[PDB]
Amino acid sequence: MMYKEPFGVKVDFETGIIEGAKKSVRRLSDMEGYFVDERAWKELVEKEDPVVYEVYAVEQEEKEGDLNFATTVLYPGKVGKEFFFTKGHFHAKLDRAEVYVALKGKGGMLLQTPEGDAKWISMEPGTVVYVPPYWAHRTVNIGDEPFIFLAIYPADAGHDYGTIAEKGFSKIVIEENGEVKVVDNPRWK
Amino acid sequence: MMYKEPFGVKVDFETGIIEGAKKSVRRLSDMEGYFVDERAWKELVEKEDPVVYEVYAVEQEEKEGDLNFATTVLYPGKVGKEFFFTKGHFHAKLDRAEVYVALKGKGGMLLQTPEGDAKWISMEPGTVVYVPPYWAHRTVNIGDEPFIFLAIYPADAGHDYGTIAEKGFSKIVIEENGEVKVVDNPRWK
Numbered sequence: 001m002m003y004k005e006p007f008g009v010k011v012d013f014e015t016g017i018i019e020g021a022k023k024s025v026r027r028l029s030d031m032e033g034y035f036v037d038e039r040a041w042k043e044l045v046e047k048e049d050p051v052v053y054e055v056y057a058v059e060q061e062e063k064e065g066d067l068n069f070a071t072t073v074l075y076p077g078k079v080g081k082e083f084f085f086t087k088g089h090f091h092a093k094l095d096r097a098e099v100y101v102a103l104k105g106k107g108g109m110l111l112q113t114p115e116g117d118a119k120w121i122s123m124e125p126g127t128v129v130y131v132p133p134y135w136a137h138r139t140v141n142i143g144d145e146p147f148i149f150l151a152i153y154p155a156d157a158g159h160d161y162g163t164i165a166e167k168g169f170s171k172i173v174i175e176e177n178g179e180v181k182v183v184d185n186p187r188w189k
Numbered sequence: 190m191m192y193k194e195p196f197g198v199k200v201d202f203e204t205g206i207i208e209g210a211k212k213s214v215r216r217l218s219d220m221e222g223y224f225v226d227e228r229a230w231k232e233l234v235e236k237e238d239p240v241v242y243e244v245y246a247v248e249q250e251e252k253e254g255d256l257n258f259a260t261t262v263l264y265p266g267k268v269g270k271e272f273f274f275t276k277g278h279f280h281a282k283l284d285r286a287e288v289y290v291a292l293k294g295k296g297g298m299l300l301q302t303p304e305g306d307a308k309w310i311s312m313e314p315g316t317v318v319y320v321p322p323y324w325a326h327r328t329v330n331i332g333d334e335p336f337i338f339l340a341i342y343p344a345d346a347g348h349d350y351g352t353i354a355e356k357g358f359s360k361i362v363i364e365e366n367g368e369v370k371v372v373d374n375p376r377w378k
């Protein structure tokens with residue numbers, strides 16, 4: 001058989017860039033139907049259409065037992081009162097877990113089961129987050145600077161974006177009165 | 190079903206300590222038959238029996254698709270000319286990969302296939318190492334300070350220490366004339 005070649009890659013903990021990896025870019029215009037305030041969404045697309053996040057992924061052939069890894073640079077910002085976040089997804093193989101390692105900035109993870117129960121975990125540099133089997137996961141930047149992390153996940157986990165794209169998460173993360181709040185999502189069913 | 194509880198845990202990138210995790214300690218006396226210079230090994234056990242490394246592990250029930258993670262603090266030192274290293278192991282489920290994230294110090298990984306072909310990857314802070322399916326892996330501290338890293342691995346990978354405990358790695362990492370060398374292991378067959 002072919003034994004795949006082990007390698008090291010340099011990851012800059014300040015920028016989240018993985019050398020030689022190749023940027024994927026999600027702009028706000030790529031996230032129609034995600035934010036609670038749709039008029040604020042449309043207005044911010046019209047005015048700027050900012051980058052919400054960039055991902056650098058190092059991925060293997062989809063195979064049981066193997067591992068992918070990726071950094072994300074989640075930029076600071078809000079759509080109305082709602083903080084910039086990642087689209088969020090379940091795994092296609094639902095029981096695949098994930099481990100995140102927060103590197104820079106201030107953020108957190110929203111997680112949700114298929115039954116709709118949600119949980120928020122704060123993330124600051126050094127926080128390692130265990131994303132268990134069956135939990136959808138979205139990251140949120142609650143600060144003024146990029147929120148950068150590294151995620152390691154099974155190479156056969158896949159992605160289910162569609163479920164979240166239609167129903168959302170049952171909780172949202174907003175700023176009111178200069179204070180960060182995690183509250184029920186008024187649009188969730 | 191029970192959806193396991195997501196959590197965050199704080200990892201100190203300076204000490205490698207995972208809060209609430211619980212030290213496993215490997216002393217030199219726990220590594221009989223590992224180092225090329227057995228008399229140097231015995232003498233250093235007699236004189237000090239130093240800690241070679243400590244591990245902090247956060248482990249799940251063994252289950253396909255799930256993930257464990259662990260930090261290691263590999264202390265600086267030599268047995269004769271050979272740098273302190275971890276015992277090293279294959280996975281029990283051979284095709285399970287691993288991802289390492291170097292946090293502090295200066296070190297590297299030695300990897301080996303079941304056919305005996307070895308590869309060395311240098312590790313400095315920020316280096317992420319892809320340990321592919323089928324490769325045994327050992328880390329080595331080539332510096333004067335603790336070499337600290339975080340590793341993420343499948344919860345069902347298991348460990349095969351025995352193979353390495355008998356045959357070793359086909360390469361060793363030594364200091365001669367103040368220079369670090371990776372050379373053939375004279376005791377390998």
Ligand SMILES: O=C(O)[C@@H](O)[C@H](O)[C@H](O)COP(=O)(O)O
Nearest residue numbers: 055070072086087088089151153
């Ligand atoms: O492994 C992961 O889940 C991450 O690398 C995410 O894919 C990344 O943060 C981007 O988020 P999303 O995939 O939800 O758009």
Ligand SMILES: O=C(O)[C@@H](O)[C@H](O)[C@H](O)COP(=O)(O)O
Nearest residue numbers: 244259261275276277278340342
């Ligand atoms: O996941 C791993 O392989 C690491 O956490 C190692 O177990 C750790 O570095 C200790 O090395 P060893 O298991 O070879 O004694």
Ligand SMILES: [Mn+2]
Nearest residue numbers: 089098137153
């Ligand atoms: Mn994921």
Ligand SMILES: [Mn+2]
Nearest residue numbers: 278287326342
């Ligand atoms: Mn391992």
